[PDB]
Amino acid sequence: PDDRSWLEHHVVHQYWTARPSQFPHSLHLHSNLAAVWDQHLYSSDPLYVPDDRVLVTETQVIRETLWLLSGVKKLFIFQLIDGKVTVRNNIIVTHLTHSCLRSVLEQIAAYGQVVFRLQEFIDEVMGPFRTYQAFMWALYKYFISFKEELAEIEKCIINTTITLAIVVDKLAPRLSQLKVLHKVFSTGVAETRNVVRASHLLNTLYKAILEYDEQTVSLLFSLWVETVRPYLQTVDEWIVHGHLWDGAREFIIQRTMVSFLKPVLKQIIMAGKSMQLLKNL
Amino acid sequence: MIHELLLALSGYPGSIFTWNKRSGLQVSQDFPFLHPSETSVLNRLCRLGTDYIRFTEFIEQYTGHVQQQQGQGGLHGIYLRAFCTGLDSVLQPYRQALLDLEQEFLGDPHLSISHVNYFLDQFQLLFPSVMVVVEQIKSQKIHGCQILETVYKHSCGGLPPVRSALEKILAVCHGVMYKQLSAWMLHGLLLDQHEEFFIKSLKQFSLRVEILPSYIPVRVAEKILFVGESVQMF
Amino acid sequence: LQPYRQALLDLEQEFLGDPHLSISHVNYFLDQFQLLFPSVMVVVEQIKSQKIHGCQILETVYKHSCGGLPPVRSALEKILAVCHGVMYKQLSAWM
Amino acid sequence: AAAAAANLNAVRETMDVLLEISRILNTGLDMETLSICVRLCEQGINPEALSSVIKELRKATEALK
Amino acid sequence: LWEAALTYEASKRRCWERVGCPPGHREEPYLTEAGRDAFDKFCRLHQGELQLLAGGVLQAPQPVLVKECELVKDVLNVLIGVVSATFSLPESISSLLSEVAEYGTCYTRLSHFSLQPKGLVFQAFTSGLRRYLQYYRACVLSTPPTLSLLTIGFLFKKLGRQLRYLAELCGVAFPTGVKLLSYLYQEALHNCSNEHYPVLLSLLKTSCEPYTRFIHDWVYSGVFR
């Protein structure tokens, strides 16, 4: 009826709303494994009692997964119950029976957990002590370039044949580097003064770059460079401006501290204090 | 979606995105075309338009609103105008981005909502941050030179977009202070009435020490005070 | 293992269009990887069963990169050069 | 229609299989001239009789050259 | 005949639910596999539901008819300050409509003040006002002769607010002579470094051009002016 008809046609309306799914099907064993296995199960007499599933097709899984991987969630599939990922069990296609399926979506949910912990931290930036801000900036710069790939592949669904095993395999050298961040960030989740909490995180990066002393090392390198960036500024400020930096004791020098600047530290102190003794002269 | 999203984000909201004064922009929930997949992207998209409407209301509120004076001075004066004028100059790439979005919509309108979210993620961090600076400026009814200190303190952060954006507004507000300083040191005349510019020979030309900005030492204020008192004397 | 990934994409790309292909095509087509995988299986199970994590892992690689069948003869040759490449940072920080 | 195009898709497949068999036997016929000969083969034809004419006109495309 | 048809190209979209020759139909297009048409359909349905739940008194603002370019030209004409049909002299269109109507109401109160041919400083003040009116006339219809509706609201954000300040500048008695000369003087010092500074400076520079000639008479010729 002129609005509802266009809605009905050019919007699916069958895996997110109360409506049984329809799609023209190509039967005959080579793509019919779910229905074949269903009939086999019933013939062996379980006795019957089916599984509550609404029959969703193949590509809808692909679109829903891409949105889960991009960084958003709370879709119709893959909801949270306390902030823990959970797979819907009403999914089954006219093939694969949903036994391999529950497992492949379990791996995708496991990566969604890794992105959920990060988004919880990043959202609580807005409701941050200039090193945490410079750390958030590194995470954010990763997230934009990372979100690009997931949007760009979703464009090719609107164009082209696409299946699951290509887009899973394609994201292996991206989900690999993400797990390294899941382990570096766990030490910054482990937690004192905020500068002690910052040193406990910051020393992990300085250790992790020498661990691979490639592509992981350039990532950890770029995460390192943007977080010692406040400190190089403030030590230069102590040298030329002749005063110790006050940031509610955000500064690592005692006048709790990493091994980065330790082998040259006496040359920092012996320059800053001597400049301060020139300010009084 | 096509005209509506740009219309809502630009600050001319409708009935899909009902503007509230207590939640900003908000979609009217479940429809038989709106479903939980696109919903989260929509909710994240609403924040930009919320902050934008607040910004433009504030800019209109404190720019061009008097004709040389009710009689309050915390709700009037040159520094409020200068802040709103600087914020209007900073907001230009958001408007430009929405223009380019419409051009791509015309070329093909089958662009998903997450695509627009992907382009506008660089304003997605910048808009919630600056909102508390401008909100504190309104709520605390700030008077005199303390506006400069308030924005200078938040330009010490570790997020480059936010820091650069607030620093430009502080430069705009420096413009007015330099303009009154061109008068008091050179003759002694004031230009800014009822709002402080950290300076008033002797008394009726003395230094007001307390209001002085935090990036300026007291020593240079003594030097300025000498120049003004002496040029007034001879 | 990347040519074991590509050789799985090719099959699915065939099956999307072709209606009459069956199990026999996959069993047939992946017969060359029933020579690579069982013959590198003994190398990996040798390194796990008696645990090797020294530099004498490389001698045990050079015993099976001699091969005798071409897949297990040419596969380990890729790996050994990368192992020496990490030792060429060790032996340059030495020298 | 649509079911008249799925059949024609299944005919496009078959024509490409006959195209492979045409190219490994290295017939001078390209994709266009072969599409005349398939229409002839649909109506019934003796390809010994077509082959005797094609073996002469292919030698008489180079006789007046 | 089969071969006359055959010389096409098959679709690249295919599924493992569709192995027996999909000619391309889809898995039923998603919401954003349609746009700028389906847009108007759900906006029309939402508006109809609103009109039902109210009683038809909620007043649909352009439910369909008219389209974009005609509405753009109507939006443009209000900035010329002359008569329109739904502005002062989808359903998000009312919110844009009110802002463009309020742009036109402050445009009109300047041409109304500049049709005059009070003193000599009054005519100089008005002749300075037209120097901004010309920039505004150059801004509209040259940049958007038919171009997109939202570009109007963005283009006259920096300029419509300034024009609305100029509406408060004009009286619509208003001062004249030395009274006006001190009025505009206080306008200089109150807004001395802003976006409103050079326009007010150009106003003050020429609104004293009669006054200096008045001062130049009784001293230099002994005859009062």
Swiss-Prot record, chain A:
Subcellular location: Cytoplasm, Cytoskeleton, Microtubule organizing center, Centrosome
Tissue expression as described in the entry: Widely expressed, with highest levels in heart and skeletal muscle and moderate levels in brain.
Signal peptide: none
Protein species of origin: Homo sapiens (Human)
Listed name of the protein: Gamma-tubulin complex component 5
The protein's assembly and partners: Component of the gamma-tubulin ring complex (gTuRC) consisting of TUBGCP2, TUBGCP3, TUBGCP4, TUBGCP5 and TUBGCP6 and gamma-tubulin TUBG1 or TUBG2. TUBGCP2, TUBGCP3, TUBGCP4, TUBGCP5 and TUBGCP6 assemble in a 5:5:2:1:1 stoichiometry; each is associated with a gamma-tubulin, thereby arranging 14 gamma-tubulins in a helical manner. Gamma-tubulin at the first position is blocked by TUBGCP3 at the last position, allowing 13 protafilaments to grow into a microtubule.
Described purpose of this protein according to its UniProt entry: Component of the gamma-tubulin ring complex (gTuRC) which mediates microtubule nucleation. The gTuRC regulates the minus-end nucleation of alpha-beta tubulin heterodimers that grow into microtubule protafilaments, a critical step in centrosome duplication and spindle formation.
Domain of life: Eukaryota
Residue span relative to the full protein: 210 to 572 of 1024
Gene name of the encoded protein: TUBGCP5
Family (UniProt): Belongs to the TUBGCP family.
Swiss-Prot record, chain B:
Gene Ontology MF terms: gamma-tubulin binding; structural constituent of cytoskeleton
One GO process term, biological-process aspect: protein-containing complex assembly
Location(s) in or outside the cell: Cytoplasm, Cytoskeleton, Microtubule organizing center, Centrosome
UniProt entry keywords in alphabetical sequence: Cytoplasm, Cytoskeleton, Intellectual disability, Microtubule, Primary microcephaly
Gene Ontology CC annotations of this record: centrosome; cytosol; gamma-tubulin complex; gamma-tubulin ring complex; membrane; microtubule; microtubule cytoskeleton; recycling endosome
Domain of life: Eukaryota
Tissue expression pattern: Ubiquitously expressed.
Assembly, per entry: Component of the gamma-tubulin ring complex (gTuRC) consisting of TUBGCP2, TUBGCP3, TUBGCP4, TUBGCP5 and TUBGCP6 and gamma-tubulin TUBG1 or TUBG2. TUBGCP2, TUBGCP3, TUBGCP4, TUBGCP5 and TUBGCP6 assemble in a 5:5:2:1:1 stoichiometry; each is associated with a gamma-tubulin, thereby arranging 14 gamma-tubulins in a helical manner. Gamma-tubulin at the first position is blocked by TUBGCP3 at the last position, allowing 13 protafilaments to grow into a microtubule.
Similarity comment: family membership: Belongs to the TUBGCP family.
Protein task: Component of the gamma-tubulin ring complex (gTuRC) which mediates microtubule nucleation. The gTuRC regulates the minus-end nucleation of alpha-beta tubulin heterodimers that grow into microtubule protafilaments, a critical step in centrosome duplication and spindle formation.
Protein name, entry field: Gamma-tubulin complex component 4
This protein's encoding gene: TUBGCP4
Full-protein residues shown: 1 to 286 of 667
Swiss-Prot record, chain D:
Location in or out of the cell: Cytoplasm, Cytoskeleton, Microtubule organizing center, Centrosome; Cytoplasm, Cytoskeleton, Spindle
GO cellular component term of the entry, any: centrosome
Keywords: Acetylation, Cytoplasm, Cytoskeleton
GO biological process, alphabetically ordered: gamma-tubulin complex localization; microtubule nucleation by interphase microtubule organizing center; mitotic spindle assembly
Assembly and oligomerization: Associates with the gamma-tubulin ring complex (gTuRC) consisting of TUBGCP2, TUBGCP3, TUBGCP4, TUBGCP5 and TUBGCP6 and gamma-tubulin TUBG1 or TUBG2; within the complex, interacts with TUBGCP3 and TUBGCP6 to form a luminal bridge with actin that stabilizes the initial structure during complex assembly. Interacts with TUBG1.
Function per UniProt: Required for the recruitment and the assembly of the gamma-tubulin ring complex (gTuRC) at the centrosome. The gTuRC regulates the minus-end nucleation of alpha-beta tubulin heterodimers that grow into microtubule protafilaments, a critical step in centrosome duplication and spindle formation.
Family: Belongs to the MOZART1 family.
Protein name: Mitotic-spindle organizing protein 1
Organism for this UniProt entry: Homo sapiens
High-level lineage: Eukaryota, Metazoa, Chordata, Craniata, Vertebrata
UniProtKB/Swiss-Prot annotation, chain E:
Top-rank taxon, per record: Eukaryota
Localisation per UniProt entry: Cytoplasm, Cytoskeleton, Microtubule organizing center, Centrosome
Family statement drawn from the similarity comment of this UniProt entry: Belongs to the TUBGCP family.
Disorder: Microcephaly and chorioretinopathy, autosomal recessive, 1: A syndrome characterized by microcephaly, cognitive impairment, underdeveloped retina and choroid, and epilepsy in some patients. The more anterior parts of the retina, near the periphery and pars plana, have a grayish hue and diminutive vasculature similar to retinopathy of prematurity. Visual impairment becomes evident during the first year of life.
Physiological role: Component of the gamma-tubulin ring complex (gTuRC) which mediates microtubule nucleation. The gTuRC regulates the minus-end nucleation of alpha-beta tubulin heterodimers that grow into microtubule protafilaments, a critical step in centrosome duplication and spindle formation.
Protein name as annotated: Gamma-tubulin complex component 6
Native organism: Homo sapiens
Gene: TUBGCP6
Shown residues within the full chain: 282 to 546 of 1819
